[PDB]
Amino acid sequence: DKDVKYYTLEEIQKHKDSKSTWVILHHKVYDLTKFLEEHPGGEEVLREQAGGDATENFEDVGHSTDARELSKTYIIGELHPDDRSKIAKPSETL
Ligand code: HEM
Numbered sequence: 001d002k003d004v005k006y007y008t009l010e011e012i013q014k015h016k017d018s019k020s021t022w023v024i025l026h027h028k029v030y031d032l033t034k035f036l037e038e039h040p041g042g043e044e045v046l047r048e049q050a051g052g053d054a055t056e057n058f059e060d061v062g063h064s065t066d067a068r069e070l071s072k073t074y075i076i077g078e079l080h081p082d083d084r085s086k087i088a089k090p091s092e093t094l
Pocket residue numbers: 023030035039040041042045046049054057058061063064067068070071074
């Protein structure tokens with residue numbers, strides 16, 4: 001796809017603080033900071049795995065599919081292709 005913006009981990013690593021907490025899931029990054037007081041799970045959970053792969057931490061609670069679609073709302077961009085291939089692959093790979 002075009003237009004969309006591709007972010008890298010090296011960058012996200014920056015916004016790894018409460019002020020700006022990001023999380024990568026399903027080879028896709030989203031805005032957690034905005035979904036800090038929206039997540040029916042809490043904040044610590046997110047922070048716990050802020051600016052880092054939370055595939056397991058995500059699939060652990062087998063996030064409902066409705067979430068995979070809800071995320072769209074709180075979308076931010078995509079995760080660099082060279083980044084995803086940096087840690088095998090966050091959630092699935094095929
Ligand atoms: C790394 C990040 C995340 C972690 C670690 C996480 C963890 C969890 C956990 C453990 C639950 C259960 C309640 C709790 O103890 O918190 C839960 C539920 C839920 N989470 Fe997350 N979550 C994350 C990100 C997200 C995101 C981005 C969304 C939305 C896009 C989301 C949407 C939901 C919803 C809707 C529920 C209720 C599950 C149900 O469908 O029954 N979560 N989450």
